[PDB]
Nucleic acid binder design. Structure first.
Ligand SMILES: [Mg+2]
Ligand SMILES: [Mg+2]
Ligand SMILES: [Zn+2]
Ligand SMILES: [Zn+2]
Ligand SMILES: [Zn+2]
Ligand SMILES: [Zn+2]
Lengths: 162, 162
DNA sequence: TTGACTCTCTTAA
DNA sequence: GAGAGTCA
DNA sequence: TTGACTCTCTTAA
DNA sequence: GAGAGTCA
């Protein structure tokens, strides 16, 4: 809604409902050959999802609340950050999953940062493998690794230098 | 269609033209506090770009050659890799700039890999900062660093546990 | 055969 | 990663 | 009011 | 990060 008290009330009912999502334990790589344990509060795969929740995409959901007879709606992972600036350096703030588990709505697994910072975590070495993120990663990104490059830098002639 | 010999001729004419693009010397971070030097062969900001080159987008260009009366066209950074597999692990191969300079067409600054591998380089610590890419980075990714997270994981109540 | 424009599409966040 | 509309 | 669906859009590779 | 069309 508009007031601070109204925003807090939305965050509180959101936390309460998400707090009832089935909790799944996920064992994850932390980097440095170590492994950790995360507890994700996962939104159901099909309706009903929970009071105020509806799916707008294969892995997109929205939280809806009627305040003064007028309905307000937000991306499902954005609610915890309603009181924070919605941009940083002219870039939109986005819900970033430290657990890299889209269905998870655990606010302890979420941060609010630019889409670039958000995507970048996919390749982070992890909390025990060299992560330098100021708001630290909970695990090594799923895409961290040597890659699978088909062909590297090369030239046929002698017109170029590195 | 085009024989291997014909493709080689296209790569050679491409190298010849790009070789004449302004060569710009850039001082870049390599990771681990070290600075390096990269020499980029940059396509002009406006027409004419060079023989065979035309702009199809703000920072997208194509290379075109007519052989035996049939017109052939390729993404401008894809020519060096015309004789390589065009997919890997079921993913389309894409032109990845080891120099992170879009206008650059120096083949010694390009590699051929999946879009995920491609993007991930934006956050790499660099060849002197811990890069683990099998086809090593030439520099530290422009987006590597602490990031600028606005708000971290948090909860108002006690419904959650990490 | 070529140059200089036009257009829409792909991926995963 | 987001926005909003259509029905019941 | 609340739920369960539908659509298209943004970003930067 | 891409493929393809128009026009002279
Ligand atoms: Mg994410
Ligand atoms: Mg790139
Ligand atoms: Zn989680
Ligand atoms: Zn990290
Ligand atoms: Zn370059
Ligand atoms: Zn690297």
């Amino acid at each position: 809604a508009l007031t601070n008290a109204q925003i807090l009330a939305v965050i509180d009912s959101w936390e309460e409902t998400v707090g009832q999502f089935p909790v799944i334990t996920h064992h994850v790589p932390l980097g440095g050959g170590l492994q950790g344990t995360l507890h994700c509060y996962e939104i159901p795969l099909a309706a009903p999802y929970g009071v105020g929740f509806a799916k707008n995409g294969p892995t997109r959901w929205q939280y809806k609340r009627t305040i003064n007879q007028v309905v307000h709606r937000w991306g499902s992972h954005t609610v915890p950050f309603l009181l924070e600036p919605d941009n940083i350096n002219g870039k939109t703030c986005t819900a970033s999953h430290l657990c890299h588990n889209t269905r998870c709505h655990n606010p302890l697994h979420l941060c609010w940062e630019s889409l670039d910072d958000n995507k970048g975590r996919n390749w982070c070495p992890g909390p025990n493998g060299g992560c330098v993120h100021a708001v630290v990663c909970l695990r090594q990104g799923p895409l961290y690794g040597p890659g699978a490059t088909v062909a590297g830098p090369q030239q046929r002639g002698s017109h170029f230098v590195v």
